[PDB]
């Protein structure tokens, strides 16, 4: 699991985070801008150490006096994909760029190549664009190459800061389904996002932050249960939730909680029958 035991960070800041994310779920990390989502994300792989408290992630204890050695095996298991992760592309070819991570984490040149080729197939990159320069690709292709570079060494836990931002709707759907398949294969996906439709569609657990404190840790149905609480705590609903609220305001009784759009359509159909 990922246990945070009274975790704080100062100098954008965290204050007494207590949660236990279980292994194998799709966790959404929500909250307003500046609520400390990026700080918590960087705490997941000890880029930032806590000022007080313990982190139990991937069999590793992270403490305020945690050194900078032994983080290679932590970062081999816990991977972060930063926002605009295509910025980090630097290598001569696409394949060398993807296998930079595995070769960093002790993969052999044969193992890193096979891992890179598998994950370049998985992120949906064309086979001829392998051995091209990373700077000669399109924006979506560079995003896919960056996502393959952080998934090639098969991390146990992957933390994503807006991984499908600014993408084709089919490309956005394909990336979110890539992460859903990756979680369905036995891994933990943490999605730091401001979108709420993907939180409704894919997340099993939701971490809500507000000014650096954990304000809710529940399923998306329980997080989006009441609209007053989210508006008070600077959180948005999915559009299906807002439309269900507009239907209840009119007076249509909707069975279940319609967080997604097919669920909302099914609720409208059954509410008409």
């Amino acid at each position: 699991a990922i246990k945070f035991e009274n975790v704080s960070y100062v100098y954008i800041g965290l204050d007494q985070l207590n949660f236990s994310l279980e292994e194998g779920k799709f966790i959404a990390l929500v909250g307003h801008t500046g609520s400390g989502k990026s700080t918590l994300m960087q705490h997941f792989n000890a880029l930032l150490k806590p000022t007080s408290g313990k982190i139990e992630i991937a069999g590793y204890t992270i403490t305020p006096e945690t050194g900078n050695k032994g983080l290679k095996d932590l970062r081999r298991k816990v991977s972060l994909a930063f926002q605009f992760s295509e910025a980090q592309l630097f290598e001569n070819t696409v394949l060398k760029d993807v296998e930079y991570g595995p070769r960093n984490f002790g993969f052999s040149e044969d193992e890193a190549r096979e891992a890179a080729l598998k994950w370049l197939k998985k992120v949906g990159l064309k086979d001829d664009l392998i051995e091209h320069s990373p700077f000669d690709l399109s924006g979506g292709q560079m995003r896919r190459v960056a996502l393959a570079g952080v998934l090639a060494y098969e991390p146990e836990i992957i933390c994503l800061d807006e991984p499908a931002a600014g993408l084709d709707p089919m490309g956005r759907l394909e990336m979110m389904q890539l992460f859903k398949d990756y979680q369905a294969a036995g891994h933990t996906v943490i999605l730091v996002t401001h979108n709420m439709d993907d939180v409704a569609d894919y997340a099993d657990d939701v971490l809500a932050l507000e000014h650096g404190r954990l304000i809710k840790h529940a399923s998306p149905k329980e997080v989006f249960k009441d609209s007053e609480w989210l508006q008070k705590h600077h959180l948005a609903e999915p559009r299906s939730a807002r439309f269900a609220a507009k239907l209840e305001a009119a007076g249509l009784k909707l069975p279940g909680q319609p967080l997604t759009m097919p669920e909302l359509a099914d609720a409208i159909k059954q509410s008409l029958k």
Partner: protein
């Protein structure tokens, strides 16, 4: 009548085999909000640079871009860039000044506006967007929505006739996109101007007066949002995610609940389900 006129443009984008825009011909009506939607390779990324003259069309004899009666040539680009102001995509990559007031003043310094008039105009434009309390703030201390507000203020300070929002909200959080669109709407009907949106956000295009649809450099289809978004298969096959109301109507139609195509916004769908629940 029409403010911007494009007739038969081609841009081959400096080695590229295929032209990004191919025989493109549209007109932008004066005083309207027109949205250009399309895929990331539809050619709409070059339209704003073509309108203000930063890019030239492939053949000047057979192409014609007229802005407010002023044809674009190599010489009239500065007459056009005082009519057209573009808000670009990245908020801090268009933030040229050291502070908010210095960034808004940049376009006025280019026009050699005298400094006291410049001070009054900059203060008024900074107060026009919601940024009067941040006039001395460096861009490193601003959010993307605030820097987009400063970009809109700097464009607005020099009194243009057209604002072009070229993917302006595409790097913002959802709470910033709403604020920027509301601000641009307030600015538009407070300054009697035309807004052109190049966007992949189709909730922005749903509020437009006109929607131009681009597909591989061709003007695919044209019209109001209430007659662009009901045709769902075309926007599906050109890789465009239709707004919430229209894909909800599509899901309900796939579930047997047929709804008229003249429902354009969500409350209309609320009543359209109310009377169908009433019967």
């Amino acid at each position: 009548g029409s403010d911007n006129i494009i007739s038969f443009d081609h841009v081959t984008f400096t080695d590229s085999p295929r032209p990004a825009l191919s025989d493109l011909s549209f007109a932008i009506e004066r005083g309207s909000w027109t949205a250009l939607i399309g895929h990331n390779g539809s050619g709409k990324s070059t339209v704003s640079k073509l309108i203000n003259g930063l890019l030239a069309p492939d053949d000047l004899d057979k192409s014609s871009i007229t802005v407010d009666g002023v044809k674009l040539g190599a010489d009239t680009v500065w007459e056009v860039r005082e009519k057209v102001g573009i808000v670009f995509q990245n908020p801090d990559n268009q933030f040229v000044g050291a502070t908010v007031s210095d960034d808004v003043a940049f376009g006025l310094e280019n026009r050699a506006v005298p400094r006291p008039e410049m001070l009054k105009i900059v203060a008024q434009a900074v107060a026009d967007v919601g940024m009067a309390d941040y006039a001395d703030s460096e861009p490193s201390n601003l959010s993307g929505g605030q820097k987009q507000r400063v970009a809109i203020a700097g464009i607005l300070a020099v009194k243009p006739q057209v604002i072009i929002l070229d993917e302006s909200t595409s790097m913002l959080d959802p709470e910033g996109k709403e604020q920027i669109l509301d601000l641009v709407r307030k600015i538009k009907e407070d300054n009697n101007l035309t807004v052109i949106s190049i966007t992949h956000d189709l909730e922005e295009a749903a509020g437009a007066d006109q929607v131009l649809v681009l597909d591989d450099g061709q003007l695919l289809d044209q019209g109001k949002p209430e007659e662009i978004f009901p045709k769902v298969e075309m926007l599906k096959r050109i890789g465009l995610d239709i707004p919430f109301v229209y894909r909800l109507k599509q899901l309900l139609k796939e579930r047997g609940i047929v709804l008229p195509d003249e429902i354009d916004d969500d409350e209309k769908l609320v009543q359209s389900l109310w009377q169908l629940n009433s019967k």
